[PDB]
Every structure is written in C-alpha cells, then in structure tokens.
Curated annotation (Swiss-Prot), chain A:
It is found in: Cytoplasm. The modification is impaired by hypoxia. Component of the large ribosomal subunit. Interacts with CRY1. It comes from Oryctolagus cuniculus. It comes from the Eukaryota. The lineage of its organism: Eukaryota, Metazoa, Chordata, Craniata, Vertebrata. Belongs to the universal ribosomal protein uL2 family. Component of the large ribosomal subunit. The ribosome is a large ribonucleoprotein complex responsible for the synthesis of proteins in the cell. This is Large ribosomal subunit protein uL2.
Curated annotation (Swiss-Prot), chain B:
The gene is RPL7A. It is linked to Chromosomal recombination involving RPL7A activates the receptor kinase domain of the TRK oncogene. Component of the large ribosomal subunit. Interacts with CRY1. Interacts with DICER1, AGO2, TARBP2, MOV10 and EIF6; they form a large RNA-induced silencing complex (RISC). GO terms for biological process: cytoplasmic translation; maturation of LSU-rRNA; translation. PANTHER family: RIBOSOMAL PROTEIN L7AE FAMILY MEMBER (PTHR23105). GO terms for cellular component: cytoplasm; cytosol; cytosolic large ribosomal subunit; cytosolic ribosome; focal adhesion; membrane; nucleolus; nucleus. Component of the large ribosomal subunit. The ribosome is a large ribonucleoprotein complex responsible for the synthesis of proteins in the cell. This is Large ribosomal subunit protein eL8. The keyword Transferase does not apply. It is found in: Cytoplasm. Belongs to the eukaryotic ribosomal protein eL8 family. InterPro entries: eL8/uL1-like (IPR050257), Ribosomal_eL30-like_sf (IPR029064), Ribosomal_eL8-like_CS (IPR004037), Ribosomal_eL8/eL30/eS12/Gad45 (IPR004038), Ribosomal_eL8/Nhp2 (IPR018492), Ribosomal_eL8_euk (IPR001921). There is a cross-link at residues 23, 72, 100, 220 (Glycyl lysine isopeptide (Lys-Gly) (interchain with G-Cter in SUMO2)). The modification N6-acetyllysine is found at residues 9, 72, 192.
Curated annotation (Swiss-Prot), chain C:
Component of the large ribosomal subunit. This is Large ribosomal subunit protein eL34. It is found in: Cytoplasm, Cytosol; Cytoplasm; Endoplasmic reticulum. Belongs to the eukaryotic ribosomal protein eL34 family. The gene is RPL34. There is a cross-link at residue 50 (Glycyl lysine isopeptide (Lys-Gly) (interchain with G-Cter in SUMO2)). It comes from Oryctolagus cuniculus. It comes from the Eukaryota. Component of the large ribosomal subunit. The ribosome is a large ribonucleoprotein complex responsible for the synthesis of proteins in the cell.
Swiss-Prot record, chain D:
This is Large ribosomal subunit protein uL23. GO terms for cellular component: cytosolic ribosome; nucleus; ribosomal subunit. One of its GO terms (biological process) is translation. The lineage of its organism: Eukaryota, Metazoa, Chordata, Craniata, Vertebrata. The modification Phosphothreonine is found at residue 8. N-terminus is methylated by METTL11A/NTM1. Belongs to the universal ribosomal protein uL23 family. The N-terminal beta-like import receptor binding (BIB) domain mediates interaction with IPO5, IPO7, KPNB1 and TNPO1. Transmembrane segments: none annotated. The keyword Ribosomal protein applies. Component of the large ribosomal subunit. Interacts with LYAR and GNL2. Interacts with MDM2; this interaction may promote MDM2-mediated p53/TP53 polyubiquitination. Directly interacts (via BIB domain) with IPO5, IPO7, KPNB1 and TNPO1; these interactions are involved in RPL23A nuclear import for the assembly of ribosomal subunits. Interacts with IPO8. The chain holds residues 38 to 156 of 156 of the full protein. It comes from Oryctolagus cuniculus.
RNA sequence: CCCCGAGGGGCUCUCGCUUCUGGCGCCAAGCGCCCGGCCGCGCGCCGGCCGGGCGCGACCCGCUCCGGGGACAGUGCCAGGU
RNA sequence: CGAGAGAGGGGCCCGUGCCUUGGAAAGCGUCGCGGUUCCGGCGGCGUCCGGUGAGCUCUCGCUGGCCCUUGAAAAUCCGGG
RNA sequence: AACAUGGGUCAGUCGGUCCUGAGAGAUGGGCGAGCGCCGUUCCGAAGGGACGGGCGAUGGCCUCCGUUGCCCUCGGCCGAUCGAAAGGGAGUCGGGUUCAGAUCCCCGAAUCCGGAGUGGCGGAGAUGGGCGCCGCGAGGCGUCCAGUGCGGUAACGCGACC
C-alpha cells in the first residue's frame, strides 16, 4: 500500500446472499501468506489472522 | 409426482456457508422512504409518551355495531347532495306556478355538519345528539367540544373516521354532525342509542378528564425488563432471610 | 493482439480446443485444469466419507 | 402478491402520457431557408478550376457554409439532373464552403459546364 | 438427571452442527392441495393424452434498521477569566 | 535439477527479416527517335554477386540490481463456467 | 516580410469529437438578509431498460413474420456533466500531378466499423445405422432408431462447431 509499510492483504469472500464475491483489504497480520483460508466471525476459534 | 426412476430430490441445506440463503419477504428491515418513516415514528411516539387527558379522551371511541345503528339512522337523514339539489329546486320552481311549493317551505329535520354550526347550536342547547370524528388533523379543532357537551348535558359520541362523516354528505369529510330533532317515529330509536352513548361518554366525564394515555413502553424494553424481573422473582429469598 | 482487434479474429484462433480453457496461461491450461480435479473429486469423495462418519458415531 | 425481495425501496414506475396540445405551440411550418438554390450559390471559374474540369471530370461549386456533403450532392443532382460520383468540401479562409464535386464517370464535364454557363 | 413398562413425560445447554487442500455452490428439487385443453364416454374433478396456480419446503408474534452513548455532549443568548 | 538434470521426439507465441501474390507496366540510371510546341511521348541496355562488425540508431527478447518510492484510470473488446 | 490586383487549404483510414486522470462543477440536503455559497454519496421514493410468458391493438399474406399498448417477470441508483489536438482510442499504402494543396486530388492495390432482420449467393449443421423384401451389383420399398462439429495419449490443431 503506497505510503504505508504495513502491506495489505486482499481477501476473496463468497457473499452469502447472492451469487458473487466481495474482495476486501485487511491489514495483513504477520505470518499469513497467499493461499491461506481466513476465518472471520463469532465462532471462528483462535488462529493467526 | 409419479415414480420415475430418475427423479431426485437434490435437498437443500441452508445455514451459514452451506448454500446461499433464498430471497424471502422482508418488511421489517427495508429502508422505507422518508415520509413513511415519518408516519411510523409519529404513530409510535403517540404511545411512547403520555398524551394529555383532553387528547386521551379521543381514544375511547364507540363500539362498531353501535356506530352501525347510528349510521343506518343517519342514512335516512343525509342532506341533499348534487344532482338531487338541482332536480328538487327545479321541480319547486315549477310548483311555484302551481302554488304548492317554492324555495321557502318546510324541510324535515336534517344533519348539521360544520363545526361552527354544531358548536353554535350546542351552546344554544338545541342539540339532541352530537357525533365527532376522532381523527382530525389539528386536534385543537375539537379538543374542547366534549367539555362543552358536558357543560350543557348534550349527548355526544366519538366515532372512528372522518371519512364516514364525509360520506354522510357529498363532501369528502366533516368533522362533526348533529341531530337536533328527528322524525317522531324515529325518536325512540334515536333515544335508545342516545342512552347507550351517554351512559359511556357523559356520566363519567370525571374519569375521562382524569384519564391519561400512552406511556406504553416498547416490546424490546418490555422483554429487557422482564429478564431482570424474572430473575429477581425466581431467586428471591436468596439469603437465609 | 490488441484487445480491440478481437472483433474480427476467427473464433477458433482465440481459444484452445479444450473445455474450461482459453482463459488460462500455459501453466494454468495444464496445472490449473488438473488441479481443478485433483482437488475437486478428492474433496467430494472425502465429504461423502465424513458424512458417513457423521452418521456413524 | 410478491411484496418484497430487496431491502431497497425503489420508486414505483407510474404511467406517463403524451402531449395532446390544445393549441399547436407555434402557428405554421417554417419553410426551408435553403431549398437547393441556397446550397448552390454560384460556380467558380479559375485556371485552377478549369484544370479540374478538363482533367478530373470534376465541378467546383461554392456553397453556404452550413451545407452537408449529402445536401450538396442531392441539391446539385436535382438542379442539373447530373449524377455525382462523390463530393469533398473545404472552408476557404474567406468563409464560403468551396465544394469539389466529382461527377459520375458517365457524364462529360466539358459538356455539362458549358451547359451551366461557365467557360 | 427425576422417572421406564422399551412408549415416553418432567429439567439445563444446545443448534442452524460451513476447518487438512488457493475447487463446488444462483435464477428450486421434492411433496400436498387446486383446477384449465385432447382422445377412449358424451355420467365425467374416470384412465390416458397437454399445460399452469397456491401451500409446505423457508414456523408464529411484534412499536422503532441494527448496534452505541443520553437527558449529558451540543446549539442559541447572556455572564466572568484568557 | 527427484517439485524430474542432461538426453531424444513435439506444440505454440512473435515474425518488420527472405520467397511470391502488389510486379514492372510503376520507379530509377543510361544510349536514342519522333510530338519537335502541350506530351505521366515512344524505342533500347541496365537495376548484378559476395563479404564485414564489440561500429552507430531504432526495434524485438532474456536476465538481473534498486526502494522506509512499487510505478494511472476508465471508454472498449474478448475467454471460459 | 512593403504596396496593389489576382489565386491557394479537398480525408471513413491524418487529428478533434470517444473515455478518464489531477481536478472541476449541478438538482436531493444544508447554510445564507442576499446575488448565492458549502458539498459530490454524504440527511435523497435516484433504474423510462429488457431475454422471455399472458392479454389487447394492429400491417403484409395480421400465412406467420414486423409494430405498438396492457399485464408479469428481471435489474445496484452503487451516482448528472465537463476535463488530455503529447496519455488509453478499431481502420491507408506506393507511384503521379501543381504558379501554391497531398497518407486528402489522379492511377493502383487494401482495409475497420455499421448496415442487408426480405437468409443474396455457396460452405458447415448433415445427412446416415439396423432392418425384411426386387436385385450379381447398384439402389430400391416400408420400418424404426442417432445426429447443437472433427483429430491427436499431451501441449493444441482443422474453415466455421447453437
């Protein structure tokens, strides 16, 4: 991300109301990589990022 | 719906991430337009605060069937509408040459619609029954009226809808109507409904004017307080006291 | 070619003869199309196996 | 019924009408301010024009600055009853649209010219 | 767990049970109720021929979109200090 | 470079270079004759064979180095499911 | 290069127009005595579109195709508009010609897009497989059934391939 040393992670999510994908940009937590599956929500148990 | 060796259910399982949820009728969440939001908010406000006594009197309206007898009574008494006015007057002009009818001649008792006229004849005590539409745009139009009827003992009732009183003439709405006198043959039928009305709206002016309204807390907070009331009722006598 | 040229180029010239291809790169044309199977079929079968496991406590 | 599928309230699509004017807003047709004779003002005669006539079988007219190539073509063809192969124009630094009109191959420019009047 | 007779009642949490894989997921399946046109009958909601609706599948009820503060931020006018 | 080295047998991408279609009739350089003037006038013979290169200029491609800089957007057109 | 009188600038293919950048700037809303200013998705009922089904109204030849209104059914308004002769932006080259104009005029040889919804022509779709009978044969008679491409193990090819 120009003018910031904390590189962004661009993530593809399936949109659970239609047939499409939403692509967000989080602040990449240290140690995550391409090809990881990131779990987001209330019941996603402890993992990095 | 017959036995075909190939027909197959393909059952769906919703749930988060299993298969995308299906479109369903939403009416609780939609971003309504501004005016609709306004109507909702006002209607809710009128419960969520306390209306004054002179406003809360406007919510103990009549029983539907009683109002139906009132209206069926009126529909034999409605004033002359258009295309009736003209024909009666023209026939009366022609009766002038026959000396049997003009514009000046007896009209049987009819309705009195406008607020000014109704209040005039109430304060002259020439009214035997008064009806009042309950939903009037500025409530100050007829906030005072029930008190006037209480002062002069004139029977009065609070009906639903200004539209019905409008239909009682050719016009679209009429704030009040009033019977001053009626045909004797219908006087008794009047008087029975008159007694039914005055039993509930006049003799208890004390409780009516003492009444308060609204102040009804929304269901969300109702349940939210019900939690703690259930908790305290359940676990009371917690100490050996 | 320039992407605006495609309005006249022959159909056949603009894509491989394979299915699910012509929108890949050589490494995709081969390994993405293999991967789309070596993942897919294994996963569906393992879903069947774990469904039988859910039925068999 | 089908009362909802989306949370976004969207304006209804009412029924719209068409003008049924009581009085026509103006009075009457405004005739063409250019029939054919205003598109074709006058021919041109210079050495660098009769060279075109006797070599390239082409006519050289001068037209009102607002006159399309299509309009010039049709108006000259209707005037002289002469079919036109093609037309190219330009705006001389004066302000007239000089119009070179390549006649069709079937007509003799030296014949139609002295028909029209030019030398 | 309190109960059992092999049926199950009463009591608490529960849940949409989506995690090994840089895949796959839409524009409904099924069932239930309805009837429209054709032939074999002219008794046709009889069979066989053609073509569609609703309901369930996707529960009901409701006063604010859901959360966060809150009678304080704040704005308006005066008042002292800087 | 065991996630397949070398080794053979292939597929594609670019393709301005060369052949031919354009095409010698055109262009050019020479000898000449008329129109002798205006001629896109008409006749001849030619436009042949090799080399060179850390040269220069374009252009095409492979591979690197740099950053606490990472390097425009849409109109448009297209592939697959 | 002055003075006076005459003459000269030819484009689907060369650029502008087309789009967006840093910005600029409208109505919803707001502020403002006020000309106006603030603001660009923020306080907005922001889609005038359509494959298609049904009904009507039609035009031919309402054969069966074309047109319109009506009824559904589907859509993110996910923000008017302008802003680049150096950015992105399909398509023209050689010879010849003038007192001045050439990728424009002339000669020759190509191109891109849009048209033909009356398919203008040919080619592909795709033209058979199994059957019993008159036949050396050939095909034949009637049956039925399949036909929204082919080839190579692969990269991908062949002229198109709903």
């Amino acid at each position: 991300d120009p003018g910031r040393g904390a590189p962004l992670a661009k993530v593809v999510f399936r949109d659970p109301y239609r047939f499409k994908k939403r692509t967000e940009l989080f602040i990449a937590a240290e140690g995550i990589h391409t090809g990881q599956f990131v779990y987001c929500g209330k019941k996603a148990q402890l993992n990095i990022g | 719906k017959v036995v075909n060796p190939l027909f197959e259910k393909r059952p769906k399982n919703f749930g988060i991430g299993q298969d995308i949820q299906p479109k369903r009728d939403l009416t609780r969440f939609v971003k309504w337009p501004r005016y609709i939001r306004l109507q909702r908010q006002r209607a809710i406000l009128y419960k969520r605060l306390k209306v004054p006594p002179a406003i809360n009197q406007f919510t103990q309206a009549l029983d539907r069937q009683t109002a139906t007898q009132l209206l069926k009574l009126a529909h034999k008494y409605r004033p002359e509408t258009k295309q009736e006015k003209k024909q009666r007057l023209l026939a009366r002009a022609e009766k002038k040459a026959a000396g049997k009818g003009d514009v000046p001649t007896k009209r049987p008792p009819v309705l009195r619609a406008g607020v000014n006229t109704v209040t005039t004849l109430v304060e002259n005590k020439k009214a035997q029954l008064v009806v009042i539409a309950h939903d009037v745009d500025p409530i100050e139009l007829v906030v005072f009226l029930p008190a006037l009827c209480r002062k002069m003992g004139v029977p009065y009732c609070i009906i639903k809808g200004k539209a019905r009183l409008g239909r009682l003439v050719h016009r679209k709405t009429c704030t009040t109507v009033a019977f001053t006198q009626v045909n004797s043959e219908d006087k008794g039928a009047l008087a029975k409904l008159v007694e039914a009305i005055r039993t509930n709206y006049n003799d208890r002016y004390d409780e009516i004017r003492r009444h308060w309204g609204g102040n009804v807390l929304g269901p969300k907070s109702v349940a939210r307080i019900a939690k703690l009331e259930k908790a305290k009722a359940k676990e009371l006598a917690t100490k050996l006291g | 070619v320039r992407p605006k040229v495609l309005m006249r180029l022959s159909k056949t010239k603009k894509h491989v003869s394979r299915a699910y291809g012509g929108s890949m790169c050589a490494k995709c044309v081969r390994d993405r199309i293999k991967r789309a199977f070596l993942i897919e079929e294994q996963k569906i079968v393992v879903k069947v196996l774990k469904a039988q496991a859910q039925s068999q406590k | 019924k089908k009362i909802r599928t989306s949370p976004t309230f969207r304006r209804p699509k009412t029924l719209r009408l068409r003008r049924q004017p009581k009085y026509p807003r103006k009075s009457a047709p405004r005739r063409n301010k250019l029939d054919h004779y205003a598109i074709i003002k006058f021919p041109l005669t210079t050495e660098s024009a009769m060279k075109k006539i006797e070599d390239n079988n082409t006519l050289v007219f001068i037209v009102d600055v607002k006159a399309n190539k299509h309009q010039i073509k049709q108006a000259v063809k209707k005037l002289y009853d002469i079919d036109v192969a093609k037309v190219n124009t330009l705006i001389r630094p004066d302000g007239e649209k000089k119009a070179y009109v390549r006649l069709a191959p079937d007509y003799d420019a030296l014949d139609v010219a002295n028909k029209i009047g030019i030398i």
